């Protein structure tokens, strides 16, 4: 109190203690002593200790949290031109803490710290000019400030420059400039810089495409628990891009990415369960992750969830919920959901049949090139029952679907060519289309091919081959069963014995 | 064999073909007209060869065939039949029977033009205006179209009228347009009757006269011309040249909307929403709004955007609201630029975007939209989302108040009364506070009540403080707490006296 050297020793001691105890990963008991020493050192006038003691009070570390007490000591340090304290005052005005919200004063504090070459001041001013925070938005001015912090190595400013030159939202897109700053961020261990550098290698933006290098940076970022890097690393394993294909490592990383809420990771993880790719087959686990992604707007997940309600796989069968999820994806423009919703209305299973909505959605999906939608809309146009009859449009869509090996379109085009009734006879191409559809398991085509062998249509008449084909399709097509019983009346026991034992493989060649 | 029988058979066939061609018969008399015209065409009659060729071309009483028609038009053309030459030119122009051949088409029309045929004149005019077989030349098109117009051809009179009305290829001359359009309108042509009414409605090339405009609009609309149906509806809607009749306006706008006139569809939608000329129907208004919006109508796009914001006539959807408001803001509609700016500024349903909000406010304010001038003035003054500029902020805040904006007057008066962020000017501030309080602004009525409760500038009338806070209590939370606080210190006599005083305290 009165001894001058005692005063010198006490304050110099409190400053040494505050700086040393602040750096320690301390417990709740050691944090109270840290506050005790920094209080004495802040009271003595040491600017750095006033900044540290204000930080403790702001974070509630070892002392009751108080935004206004923190501002008091940051003000005393700022009065000594403490650069970090000045940044902290700007944040309080920017966030409206203790004092009222005041963006112009936040900018003024940050600019005062920028005179001292503080990288937080540089960064926050770059953010302010990019988002229009108390200043007119000027992305080029944002780059000026962000470059100042980036050249001093601040990774957050480097990632902002990398993203800006990557999107082109404010300045011209420059992939190579983006790679420059993203690499500098990655070389310092920043997960967001490492992820974006891997994206650069993966797509070849600003650098030569290299999957092996993308895996290298994806993995360093994924091991820091960055969700989007865990997803892309899972994709490189699934596709075998830059690394050996490993469905288990894909599911390993998709699980961590799905847990953090990445919708594509959840959808991919659901496929892994439904199919058994990299995980044990499980319908409930698949629907669990499909729902997680469908609730975020993932169209493919909404469609898979809508199908799971249609047949009750992994969940209770619910035609009402199936239409709700199929429609959300169909309205998003997913062609395969537009077809499934159209087929649901066209068949009328679990809900009322509605051919107007069926034709409406079949046309939407056919126009996007969905093969099975083109087969349905081709026969609707050709029949002309629920729509005006149009043979040109019918054959247009039927041939387009048959071009992509549509088993349904092939079987019907073959039936038309073989009958030669509603169209000109084209038996040779008709039997060929019939054989192609029969190989894909279509038993209507098998019955039609058996009809050709029974009556010598293009093929040489062979009742043995006809019975064998009718027998194969008998459990699935009612005409095949009736045609098999009729042939059984006309064939001898020896012929029945050969026909039953016939391998029908040669009949489809 | 018999010479007198041959002459009498030819003359009877010629007479029959001419008389049976004028008559509009059915399938019974049609297949009998071709029999008499074939007999007269086989005899060598040039006119009957042309008529029989037309019968085969149209397929009236015989099988339709382009080549058989050309056949008899050639026999007629060898006799220099005018119309038959025009028909031979059209076949080569269109590529019927023979291959497409623009030069031969021009050559046939020019041969028919030598004999002063209006169709040859008109088609040669169209040929020079479209560049069909000849180099494009509007002046040469006017030459041919005039020759057919001097002979009374309506379609040539309309083309000249439209050219001189639009100044496309010649100097725009509204008088010259009216000159040709009148010749067309007097013959009963629906297009000439419409444009003559347009001239009377706007005073272009003729003295403005709404009663004549209605007269010609009605004659063109009765022939189902869609654009005349719209303008005739406007005259009924505005009472210009005829007694105002909203129901008669909606009547013609329905016919014009079904034909696809965007403005008719828009006006019809307003009728269904507001109830002028029809019973109110919210869903039917949105139907016609969308119909006009799809065709690029700016006001319809803005109307459909507002309807999508508040769900008025359709399911509420902020995403689609931003789409339709944006398409109208792109077209420079100042009202939609403000609505899109306010949508981005509030962030209700979509993401708040102050950058786009400021961008559209500046754009709408430069067109004189006072509401946008008020929003941008408070933005340049607050200095939160832009750099603070009080000089620019007061420039827009005054213009809004100088044109009676309740938004600006309530805030600009709040600054003058407080005297905190600006020098105290409370005398003029109370005057601005009264004006905005007149127009339902519960905020200005609240700040004016603040001057009465605390005795700020105005004579301290605490009873009037309850009367001003009363109207705003169920609407503004502060005025509700301001009317609740004054209620704790007022007696029942002063409560009953305050809830009845005429606030128009202004």
Short mmCIF file of C-alpha atoms in Angstrom, two decimals, chain A residues 39-478:
data_model
loop_
_atom_site.label_atom_id
_atom_site.label_comp_id
_atom_site.label_asym_id
_atom_site.label_seq_id
_atom_site.Cartn_x
_atom_site.Cartn_y
_atom_site.Cartn_z
CA UNK A 39 -8.30 -8.72 -12.05
CA UNK A 40 -5.29 -7.45 -10.09
CA UNK A 41 -3.25 -7.06 -13.27
CA UNK A 42 -6.08 -5.25 -15.08
CA UNK A 43 -6.51 -2.92 -12.10
CA UNK A 44 -2.80 -2.04 -12.24
CA UNK A 45 -3.16 -0.65 -15.77
CA UNK A 46 -1.60 -3.35 -17.96
CA UNK A 47 -3.44 -3.15 -21.29
CA UNK A 48 -2.97 -6.82 -22.19
CA UNK A 49 -4.28 -7.92 -18.79
CA UNK A 50 -7.32 -5.66 -19.21
CA UNK A 51 -8.01 -7.35 -22.55
CA UNK A 52 -7.58 -10.80 -21.02
CA UNK A 53 -9.71 -10.04 -17.95
CA UNK A 54 -12.41 -8.68 -20.25
CA UNK A 55 -12.24 -11.93 -22.22
CA UNK A 56 -12.70 -14.00 -19.06
CA UNK A 57 -15.74 -11.96 -18.02
CA UNK A 58 -17.18 -12.14 -21.54
CA UNK A 59 -16.83 -15.95 -21.66
CA UNK A 60 -17.88 -16.53 -18.05
CA UNK A 61 -14.65 -18.47 -17.48
CA UNK A 62 -14.07 -18.55 -13.72
CA UNK A 63 -16.33 -15.52 -13.15
CA UNK A 64 -19.95 -14.52 -13.64
CA UNK A 65 -20.53 -13.67 -17.30
CA UNK A 66 -21.21 -9.97 -17.86
CA UNK A 67 -21.10 -8.21 -21.22
CA UNK A 68 -20.85 -4.76 -19.62
CA UNK A 69 -17.99 -5.54 -17.23
CA UNK A 70 -16.06 -6.98 -20.19
CA UNK A 71 -16.65 -3.77 -22.16
CA UNK A 72 -15.33 -1.69 -19.27
CA UNK A 73 -11.91 -3.34 -19.29
CA UNK A 74 -11.74 -3.52 -23.08
CA UNK A 75 -12.36 0.24 -23.06
CA UNK A 76 -9.45 0.82 -20.68
CA UNK A 77 -7.21 -1.33 -22.89
CA UNK A 78 -8.54 0.34 -26.04
CA UNK A 79 -7.70 3.69 -24.44
CA UNK A 80 -4.11 2.39 -24.56
CA UNK A 81 -4.63 1.48 -28.26
CA UNK A 82 -4.82 -2.27 -27.55
CA UNK A 83 -5.66 -3.61 -31.01
CA UNK A 84 -7.55 -6.73 -29.91
CA UNK A 85 -9.57 -4.79 -27.33
CA UNK A 86 -10.61 -2.35 -30.05
CA UNK A 87 -11.81 -5.26 -32.20
CA UNK A 88 -13.79 -6.55 -29.22
CA UNK A 89 -15.53 -3.21 -28.73
CA UNK A 90 -16.60 -3.24 -32.38
CA UNK A 91 -18.09 -6.71 -31.96
CA UNK A 92 -20.14 -5.54 -28.97
CA UNK A 93 -21.66 -2.74 -31.05
CA UNK A 94 -22.09 -5.07 -34.03
CA UNK A 95 -23.90 -7.59 -31.81
CA UNK A 96 -25.70 -5.03 -29.64
CA UNK A 97 -24.15 -6.37 -26.43
CA UNK A 98 -24.20 -4.22 -23.27
CA UNK A 99 -24.59 -1.10 -25.45
CA UNK A 100 -27.25 -0.74 -28.14
CA UNK A 101 -26.66 -2.08 -31.64
CA UNK A 102 -24.64 0.42 -33.68
CA UNK A 103 -23.04 -0.66 -36.97
CA UNK A 104 -21.32 2.69 -37.74
CA UNK A 105 -19.50 2.55 -34.39
CA UNK A 106 -18.55 -1.10 -34.97
CA UNK A 107 -16.89 -0.11 -38.24
CA UNK A 108 -15.11 2.78 -36.51
CA UNK A 109 -13.60 0.53 -33.83
CA UNK A 110 -12.52 -2.06 -36.41
CA UNK A 111 -10.88 0.61 -38.57
CA UNK A 112 -8.93 1.87 -35.54
CA UNK A 113 -7.59 -1.65 -34.98
CA UNK A 114 -6.82 -2.01 -38.70
CA UNK A 115 -4.38 0.90 -38.40
CA UNK A 116 -2.48 -1.43 -36.05
CA UNK A 117 -2.44 -4.24 -38.67
CA UNK A 118 -4.75 -6.51 -36.65
CA UNK A 119 -6.02 -9.42 -38.74
CA UNK A 120 -9.39 -9.62 -36.97
CA UNK A 121 -9.97 -5.97 -37.89
CA UNK A 122 -8.97 -6.69 -41.49
CA UNK A 123 -11.27 -9.72 -41.62
CA UNK A 124 -14.30 -8.09 -40.00
CA UNK A 125 -13.98 -5.08 -42.31
CA UNK A 126 -13.83 -7.39 -45.32
CA UNK A 127 -16.98 -9.13 -44.10
CA UNK A 128 -18.65 -5.76 -43.53
CA UNK A 129 -17.99 -4.56 -47.08
CA UNK A 130 -19.15 -7.89 -48.52
CA UNK A 131 -22.42 -8.00 -46.54
CA UNK A 132 -23.14 -4.26 -46.37
CA UNK A 133 -22.68 -3.85 -42.61
CA UNK A 134 -22.75 -0.13 -41.89
CA UNK A 135 -21.16 0.53 -45.30
CA UNK A 136 -22.20 0.33 -48.94
CA UNK A 137 -21.64 -3.20 -50.27
CA UNK A 138 -18.49 -3.34 -52.38
CA UNK A 139 -17.00 -6.79 -53.00
CA UNK A 140 -13.80 -5.25 -54.38
CA UNK A 141 -13.34 -3.35 -51.12
CA UNK A 142 -14.04 -6.64 -49.33
CA UNK A 143 -11.16 -8.22 -51.27
CA UNK A 144 -8.85 -5.34 -50.29
CA UNK A 145 -9.45 -5.98 -46.59
CA UNK A 146 -9.57 -9.78 -46.88
CA UNK A 147 -6.26 -9.80 -48.78
CA UNK A 148 -4.60 -7.80 -46.02
CA UNK A 149 -5.59 -10.47 -43.44
CA UNK A 150 -4.91 -13.32 -45.86
CA UNK A 151 -1.33 -12.22 -46.58
CA UNK A 152 -0.85 -12.31 -42.80
CA UNK A 153 -2.15 -15.89 -42.89
CA UNK A 154 -5.63 -15.58 -41.38
CA UNK A 155 -7.38 -18.75 -42.65
CA UNK A 156 -10.92 -17.39 -42.37
CA UNK A 157 -10.02 -14.54 -44.73
CA UNK A 158 -8.32 -17.02 -47.05
CA UNK A 159 -11.44 -19.20 -47.23
CA UNK A 160 -13.58 -16.12 -47.95
CA UNK A 161 -11.33 -15.12 -50.85
CA UNK A 162 -11.34 -18.70 -52.12
CA UNK A 163 -15.14 -18.86 -52.02
CA UNK A 164 -15.51 -15.44 -53.65
CA UNK A 165 -13.21 -16.22 -56.58
CA UNK A 166 -15.01 -19.58 -56.89
CA UNK A 167 -18.61 -18.35 -57.08
CA UNK A 168 -18.06 -15.05 -58.90
CA UNK A 169 -20.59 -13.21 -56.71
CA UNK A 170 -19.09 -9.74 -56.78
CA UNK A 171 -15.86 -10.24 -58.72
CA UNK A 172 -14.96 -12.20 -61.83
CA UNK A 173 -14.66 -15.94 -61.30
CA UNK A 174 -10.99 -16.98 -61.03
CA UNK A 175 -10.59 -20.67 -60.22
CA UNK A 176 -6.80 -20.45 -60.07
CA UNK A 177 -6.89 -17.54 -57.62
CA UNK A 178 -9.36 -19.52 -55.49
CA UNK A 179 -6.98 -22.50 -55.42
CA UNK A 180 -4.14 -20.20 -54.33
CA UNK A 181 -5.92 -19.02 -51.18
CA UNK A 182 -7.58 -22.36 -50.46
CA UNK A 183 -4.19 -24.10 -50.57
CA UNK A 184 -2.67 -21.57 -48.16
CA UNK A 185 -5.61 -22.31 -45.81
CA UNK A 186 -5.21 -26.06 -46.28
CA UNK A 187 -1.44 -25.94 -45.69
CA UNK A 188 -2.26 -24.44 -42.26
CA UNK A 189 -4.62 -27.29 -41.35
CA UNK A 190 -7.96 -25.51 -41.78
CA UNK A 191 -10.67 -28.09 -42.46
CA UNK A 192 -12.67 -25.77 -44.72
CA UNK A 193 -9.57 -24.93 -46.76
CA UNK A 194 -8.66 -28.61 -47.03
CA UNK A 195 -12.16 -29.57 -48.19
CA UNK A 196 -12.31 -26.88 -50.87
CA UNK A 197 -8.82 -27.75 -52.11
CA UNK A 198 -9.97 -31.34 -52.53
CA UNK A 199 -13.01 -30.13 -54.46
CA UNK A 200 -10.61 -28.21 -56.70
CA UNK A 201 -8.59 -31.36 -57.43
CA UNK A 202 -11.73 -33.47 -57.85
CA UNK A 203 -13.40 -31.31 -60.51
CA UNK A 204 -10.25 -29.77 -61.97
CA UNK A 205 -11.20 -26.15 -61.20
CA UNK A 206 -8.10 -23.96 -61.06
CA UNK A 207 -5.79 -26.99 -61.17
CA UNK A 208 -5.39 -30.24 -63.09
CA UNK A 209 -7.94 -32.88 -62.10
CA UNK A 210 -6.42 -35.42 -59.71
CA UNK A 211 -8.69 -37.82 -57.82
CA UNK A 212 -5.80 -39.18 -55.73
CA UNK A 213 -4.99 -35.67 -54.52
CA UNK A 214 -8.66 -34.92 -53.84
CA UNK A 215 -8.85 -38.02 -51.63
CA UNK A 216 -5.71 -36.82 -49.82
CA UNK A 217 -7.27 -33.47 -48.89
CA UNK A 218 -10.78 -34.84 -48.35
CA UNK A 219 -9.34 -37.29 -45.82
CA UNK A 220 -7.43 -34.64 -43.85
CA UNK A 221 -10.60 -32.54 -43.71
CA UNK A 222 -12.88 -35.48 -42.91
CA UNK A 223 -10.64 -36.52 -40.01
CA UNK A 224 -11.35 -33.09 -38.50
CA UNK A 225 -15.07 -34.03 -38.53
CA UNK A 226 -16.02 -31.58 -41.31
CA UNK A 227 -19.31 -32.98 -42.58
CA UNK A 228 -19.18 -32.04 -46.26
CA UNK A 229 -15.68 -33.50 -46.56
CA UNK A 230 -16.86 -36.76 -44.97
CA UNK A 231 -19.49 -36.96 -47.71
CA UNK A 232 -17.17 -36.35 -50.66
CA UNK A 233 -14.59 -38.74 -49.20
CA UNK A 234 -17.37 -41.31 -48.98
CA UNK A 235 -18.16 -40.68 -52.65
CA UNK A 236 -14.55 -41.25 -53.74
CA UNK A 237 -14.61 -44.62 -51.97
CA UNK A 238 -17.97 -45.54 -53.50
CA UNK A 239 -16.89 -44.61 -57.04
CA UNK A 240 -13.26 -45.73 -56.72
CA UNK A 241 -12.00 -42.29 -57.77
CA UNK A 242 -8.40 -41.81 -56.64
CA UNK A 243 -8.60 -44.82 -54.32
CA UNK A 244 -9.66 -48.46 -54.40
CA UNK A 245 -13.43 -48.93 -54.36
CA UNK A 246 -14.54 -49.81 -50.83
CA UNK A 247 -18.26 -49.73 -50.02
CA UNK A 248 -17.47 -50.21 -46.32
CA UNK A 249 -15.32 -47.07 -46.16
CA UNK A 250 -18.09 -45.24 -48.04
CA UNK A 251 -20.71 -46.25 -45.46
CA UNK A 252 -18.17 -45.48 -42.73
CA UNK A 253 -17.86 -41.85 -43.83
CA UNK A 254 -21.48 -41.43 -44.95
CA UNK A 255 -22.64 -42.42 -41.46
CA UNK A 256 -20.70 -39.51 -39.88
CA UNK A 257 -21.84 -37.14 -42.62
CA UNK A 258 -25.45 -38.28 -42.32
CA UNK A 259 -25.35 -37.82 -38.54
CA UNK A 260 -24.35 -34.19 -39.11
CA UNK A 261 -27.31 -33.69 -41.46
CA UNK A 262 -25.91 -33.92 -45.00
CA UNK A 263 -29.00 -34.90 -47.04
CA UNK A 264 -27.13 -36.60 -49.89
CA UNK A 265 -25.14 -38.60 -47.33
CA UNK A 266 -28.39 -39.70 -45.69
CA UNK A 267 -29.88 -40.70 -49.05
CA UNK A 268 -26.75 -42.61 -50.06
CA UNK A 269 -26.62 -44.28 -46.65
CA UNK A 270 -30.24 -45.36 -47.12
CA UNK A 271 -29.40 -46.99 -50.45
CA UNK A 272 -26.57 -48.84 -48.70
CA UNK A 273 -29.05 -50.41 -46.26
CA UNK A 274 -31.74 -51.21 -48.84
CA UNK A 275 -29.30 -52.93 -51.22
CA UNK A 276 -26.65 -54.22 -48.82
CA UNK A 277 -23.75 -52.23 -50.30
CA UNK A 278 -21.18 -51.61 -47.58
CA UNK A 279 -23.64 -52.47 -44.79
CA UNK A 280 -25.99 -55.25 -43.77
CA UNK A 281 -29.32 -55.25 -45.61
CA UNK A 282 -31.99 -53.59 -43.47
CA UNK A 283 -35.26 -52.09 -44.78
CA UNK A 284 -36.02 -50.12 -41.60
CA UNK A 285 -32.58 -48.48 -41.50
CA UNK A 286 -32.99 -47.53 -45.17
CA UNK A 287 -36.35 -45.85 -44.55
CA UNK A 288 -34.89 -44.17 -41.46
CA UNK A 289 -32.32 -42.28 -43.54
CA UNK A 290 -34.60 -41.77 -46.56
CA UNK A 291 -36.95 -39.90 -44.22
CA UNK A 292 -34.09 -37.85 -42.79
CA UNK A 293 -33.25 -36.64 -46.33
CA UNK A 294 -36.83 -36.42 -47.59
CA UNK A 295 -37.69 -34.06 -44.73
CA UNK A 296 -34.97 -31.71 -46.03
CA UNK A 297 -36.31 -31.64 -49.60
CA UNK A 298 -34.21 -34.37 -51.25
CA UNK A 299 -36.34 -35.34 -54.25
CA UNK A 300 -34.75 -38.75 -54.81
CA UNK A 301 -35.24 -39.48 -51.11
CA UNK A 302 -38.88 -38.35 -51.26
CA UNK A 303 -39.41 -40.77 -54.16
CA UNK A 304 -37.72 -43.70 -52.41
CA UNK A 305 -39.74 -42.95 -49.27
CA UNK A 306 -42.88 -42.72 -51.40
CA UNK A 307 -42.16 -46.15 -52.87
CA UNK A 308 -41.53 -47.61 -49.41
CA UNK A 309 -45.06 -46.56 -48.44
CA UNK A 310 -46.47 -48.01 -51.67
CA UNK A 311 -45.35 -51.59 -50.96
CA UNK A 312 -44.80 -51.30 -47.21
CA UNK A 313 -41.06 -52.07 -47.32
CA UNK A 314 -39.39 -50.81 -44.15
CA UNK A 315 -42.61 -49.09 -43.02
CA UNK A 316 -46.34 -49.79 -42.82
CA UNK A 317 -48.04 -49.73 -46.22
CA UNK A 318 -49.88 -46.41 -46.55
CA UNK A 319 -51.19 -45.38 -49.99
CA UNK A 320 -52.06 -41.93 -48.62
CA UNK A 321 -48.50 -41.14 -47.50
CA UNK A 322 -47.07 -42.71 -50.67
CA UNK A 323 -48.92 -40.18 -52.83
CA UNK A 324 -47.87 -37.30 -50.56
CA UNK A 325 -44.16 -38.11 -50.85
CA UNK A 326 -44.27 -39.04 -54.54
CA UNK A 327 -46.04 -35.75 -55.31
CA UNK A 328 -43.50 -33.62 -53.41
CA UNK A 329 -40.73 -35.08 -55.58
CA UNK A 330 -42.84 -35.01 -58.75
CA UNK A 331 -43.55 -31.31 -58.17
CA UNK A 332 -39.79 -30.78 -57.76
CA UNK A 333 -39.42 -32.12 -61.30
CA UNK A 334 -37.96 -35.58 -60.62
CA UNK A 335 -38.92 -37.58 -63.70
CA UNK A 336 -38.99 -40.96 -61.97
CA UNK A 337 -41.28 -39.59 -59.25
CA UNK A 338 -43.59 -38.14 -61.91
CA UNK A 339 -43.83 -41.61 -63.46
CA UNK A 340 -44.46 -43.36 -60.14
CA UNK A 341 -47.16 -40.83 -59.23
CA UNK A 342 -48.68 -41.20 -62.69
CA UNK A 343 -48.68 -44.99 -62.45
CA UNK A 344 -50.25 -44.75 -58.99
CA UNK A 345 -53.11 -42.70 -60.45
CA UNK A 346 -53.29 -44.89 -63.56
CA UNK A 347 -53.55 -48.17 -61.65
CA UNK A 348 -55.55 -46.82 -58.71
CA UNK A 349 -54.01 -49.04 -56.03
CA UNK A 350 -54.94 -47.81 -52.56
CA UNK A 351 -56.48 -44.60 -53.97
CA UNK A 352 -59.06 -43.61 -56.55
CA UNK A 353 -58.07 -44.10 -60.18
CA UNK A 354 -57.57 -40.79 -62.02
CA UNK A 355 -56.46 -41.06 -65.64
CA UNK A 356 -56.33 -37.28 -66.11
CA UNK A 357 -53.61 -36.87 -63.48
CA UNK A 358 -52.06 -40.10 -64.77
CA UNK A 359 -51.73 -38.74 -68.31
CA UNK A 360 -50.61 -35.38 -66.90
CA UNK A 361 -47.68 -36.90 -65.01
CA UNK A 362 -46.82 -39.50 -67.66
CA UNK A 363 -46.33 -36.70 -70.19
CA UNK A 364 -44.13 -34.72 -67.78
CA UNK A 365 -41.85 -37.71 -67.22
CA UNK A 366 -41.84 -38.85 -70.85
CA UNK A 367 -40.75 -35.37 -71.93
CA UNK A 368 -37.74 -35.66 -69.59
CA UNK A 369 -36.82 -38.95 -71.29
CA UNK A 370 -38.01 -41.46 -68.69
CA UNK A 371 -38.30 -44.70 -70.65
CA UNK A 372 -41.17 -46.37 -68.78
CA UNK A 373 -43.24 -43.18 -68.88
CA UNK A 374 -42.87 -43.21 -72.67
CA UNK A 375 -44.12 -46.80 -72.84
CA UNK A 376 -47.27 -45.98 -70.86
CA UNK A 377 -48.06 -42.75 -72.72
CA UNK A 378 -47.42 -44.53 -76.02
CA UNK A 379 -50.19 -47.06 -75.39
CA UNK A 380 -52.57 -44.46 -73.98
CA UNK A 381 -52.23 -42.46 -77.20
CA UNK A 382 -52.55 -45.63 -79.29
CA UNK A 383 -55.64 -47.00 -77.51
CA UNK A 384 -57.33 -43.60 -77.42
CA UNK A 385 -59.64 -44.37 -74.49
CA UNK A 386 -58.57 -41.86 -71.82
CA UNK A 387 -57.08 -39.47 -74.42
CA UNK A 388 -57.73 -38.56 -78.05
CA UNK A 389 -56.45 -41.31 -80.36
CA UNK A 390 -53.09 -40.49 -81.93
CA UNK A 391 -51.21 -43.28 -83.69
CA UNK A 392 -48.27 -41.04 -84.63
CA UNK A 393 -47.61 -39.94 -81.04
CA UNK A 394 -48.23 -43.51 -79.87
CA UNK A 395 -45.61 -45.05 -82.14
CA UNK A 396 -43.31 -42.08 -81.45
CA UNK A 397 -43.18 -42.82 -77.73
CA UNK A 398 -43.36 -46.61 -78.12
CA UNK A 399 -40.31 -46.74 -80.41
CA UNK A 400 -38.43 -44.31 -78.15
CA UNK A 401 -39.10 -46.58 -75.17
CA UNK A 402 -38.31 -49.74 -77.15
CA UNK A 403 -35.03 -48.06 -78.12
CA UNK A 404 -34.02 -48.09 -74.43
CA UNK A 405 -35.00 -51.79 -74.04
CA UNK A 406 -38.39 -51.18 -72.41
CA UNK A 407 -39.79 -54.68 -71.84
CA UNK A 408 -43.31 -53.26 -71.86
CA UNK A 409 -42.98 -51.28 -75.10
CA UNK A 410 -41.19 -54.16 -76.84
CA UNK A 411 -43.94 -56.65 -75.98
CA UNK A 412 -46.73 -54.41 -77.26
CA UNK A 413 -44.94 -53.34 -80.44
CA UNK A 414 -44.29 -57.03 -81.07
CA UNK A 415 -47.95 -57.91 -80.54
CA UNK A 416 -48.98 -55.22 -83.02
CA UNK A 417 -46.46 -56.37 -85.64
CA UNK A 418 -47.37 -60.05 -85.24
CA UNK A 419 -51.15 -59.58 -85.41
CA UNK A 420 -51.02 -57.24 -88.41
CA UNK A 421 -54.55 -56.06 -87.58
CA UNK A 422 -54.47 -52.44 -86.41
CA UNK A 423 -51.16 -51.90 -88.27
CA UNK A 424 -49.42 -53.40 -91.29
CA UNK A 425 -47.94 -56.88 -90.74
CA UNK A 426 -44.31 -56.88 -89.62
CA UNK A 427 -43.91 -60.42 -88.29
CA UNK A 428 -40.12 -60.70 -88.55
CA UNK A 429 -39.47 -57.59 -86.46
CA UNK A 430 -42.44 -58.52 -84.27
CA UNK A 431 -40.99 -61.86 -83.20
CA UNK A 432 -37.61 -60.20 -82.60
CA UNK A 433 -39.15 -57.60 -80.29
CA UNK A 434 -41.11 -60.40 -78.62
CA UNK A 435 -37.92 -62.38 -77.98
CA UNK A 436 -36.18 -59.34 -76.48
CA UNK A 437 -39.03 -58.68 -74.05
CA UNK A 438 -39.37 -62.35 -73.11
CA UNK A 439 -35.71 -62.43 -72.07
CA UNK A 440 -36.39 -59.60 -69.60
CA UNK A 441 -38.93 -61.79 -67.78
CA UNK A 442 -42.04 -60.44 -69.54
CA UNK A 443 -44.42 -63.40 -69.56
CA UNK A 444 -46.88 -61.66 -71.88
CA UNK A 445 -44.14 -61.74 -74.52
CA UNK A 446 -43.43 -65.40 -73.72
CA UNK A 447 -47.10 -66.21 -74.30
CA UNK A 448 -46.99 -64.25 -77.56
CA UNK A 449 -43.85 -66.13 -78.65
CA UNK A 450 -45.57 -69.40 -77.75
CA UNK A 451 -48.51 -68.26 -79.86
CA UNK A 452 -46.12 -67.88 -82.81
CA UNK A 453 -44.71 -71.39 -82.37
CA UNK A 454 -48.23 -72.78 -81.95
CA UNK A 455 -49.47 -71.41 -85.28
CA UNK A 456 -46.28 -71.08 -87.35
CA UNK A 457 -46.08 -67.27 -87.31
CA UNK A 458 -42.67 -66.47 -88.84
CA UNK A 459 -41.14 -69.32 -86.83
CA UNK A 460 -41.66 -72.89 -87.96
CA UNK A 461 -44.73 -74.46 -86.35
CA UNK A 462 -43.69 -76.31 -83.19
CA UNK A 463 -46.31 -77.36 -80.64
CA UNK A 464 -43.61 -78.72 -78.31
CA UNK A 465 -41.99 -75.29 -78.07
CA UNK A 466 -45.44 -73.72 -77.68
CA UNK A 467 -46.32 -75.89 -74.67
CA UNK A 468 -42.93 -75.20 -73.07
CA UNK A 469 -43.41 -71.44 -73.44
CA UNK A 470 -47.05 -71.58 -72.31
CA UNK A 471 -45.96 -73.67 -69.31
CA UNK A 472 -43.33 -71.11 -68.25
CA UNK A 473 -45.80 -68.20 -68.46
CA UNK A 474 -48.74 -70.23 -67.12
CA UNK A 475 -48.46 -69.06 -63.46
CA UNK A 476 -48.31 -65.39 -64.51
CA UNK A 477 -50.59 -64.95 -67.54
CA UNK A 478 -54.13 -66.31 -67.71
#
